């Protein structure tokens, strides 16, 4: 996260760290949506252009974390993956359209003050909150820019951007399954996700019921916190039918 700040303890209890077994390192962010299901970006697990194609046994999920590198004894919980489900129409060949994946844990994780699931939006909540100007929150242990790594989980609030502006900021083909967020050059304020934040959640707190909803998944960007550029996020509600289908079937 670029231009963000240290998260407070228990501020994002649904935050999940996708951890590579060997070599041990941060692979991506993810989110907890139930005691046995974790949501992330498909490109975190599958991206042929970069020879990336992880299998269940290649990674681990670390939940309840705050510190990036330390083993948080008595706080974080580490889970093994039972199965990975990538959207069948995920477009890794071109623009990362439908960049979404689910991971089922081998055993249910116990909720605590530091581990708790985020809500997935309904049609109404999505329609009401997914508006240009409305701000969401992005969290992660990714790069602080094109420098080093953070000691603890970082957080940044960013405004959703008008679709025409998103489209005119890049040469990549944007689809309805994506939305972009970030400040404009004239707004002064800054902030963006960066390497390592991919797969993490873009959440919004509903002013109707005071619950946090995951509206997006950190998907892609060109550079980090560059003026005139914006981060792109997977539109979770638009792909909810697939999410429900997978969970109902498996």
């Amino acid at each position: 996260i670029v231009e963000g700040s240290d998260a407070e303890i228990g501020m994002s209890p649904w935050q999940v760290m996708l951890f590579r077994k060997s070599p041990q390192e941060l692979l991506c962010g993810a989110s907890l949506i139930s005691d046995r299901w974790v949501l992330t970006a498909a490109h975190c697990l599958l991206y042929p252009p970069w020879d990336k194609n992880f299998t269940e046994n290649d990674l681990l999920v670390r939940i309840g974390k705050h510190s990036r590198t330390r083993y948080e004894r008595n706080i974080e919980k580490i889970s093994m993956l039972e199965k990975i489900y990538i959207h069948p129409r995920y477009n890794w060949r071109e623009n990362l359209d439908r960049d979404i994946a689910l991971m089922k844990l081998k055993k249910p994780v116990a909720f605590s003050d530091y581990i708790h699931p985020v809500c997935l939006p309904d049609r109404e909540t999505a329609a009401s909150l997914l508006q240009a100007g409305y701000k969401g929150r992005v969290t992660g242990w990714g790069n602080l820019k094109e420098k080093g790594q953070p000691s603890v989980l970082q957080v940044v609030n960013l405004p959703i951007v008008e679709r025409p502006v998103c489209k005119d900021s890049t040469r990549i083909r944007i689809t309805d399954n994506m939305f972009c967020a970030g400040y404009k050059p004239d707004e002064g304020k800054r902030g963006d996700a960066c390497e390592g934040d991919s797969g993490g959640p873009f959440v919004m707190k509903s002013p109707f019921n005071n619950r946090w909803y995951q509206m997006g998944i950190v998907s892609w960007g060109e550079g980090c916190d560059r003026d005139g550029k914006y981060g792109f996020y997977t539109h979770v509600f638009r792909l909810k039918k697939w999410i429900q289908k997978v969970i109902d079937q498996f």
């Binding site: 951890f19 077994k21 060997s22 041990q24 390192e25 941060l26 681990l60 590198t69 330390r70 083993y71 580490i78 093994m80 790594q149």
Partner: peptide, 11 residues
């Protein structure tokens, strides 16, 4: 070795 080792029970 950037990350602290985790219990063997999770290699």
């Amino acid at each position: 070795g950037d990350f602290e080792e985790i219990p063997e029970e999770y290699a």
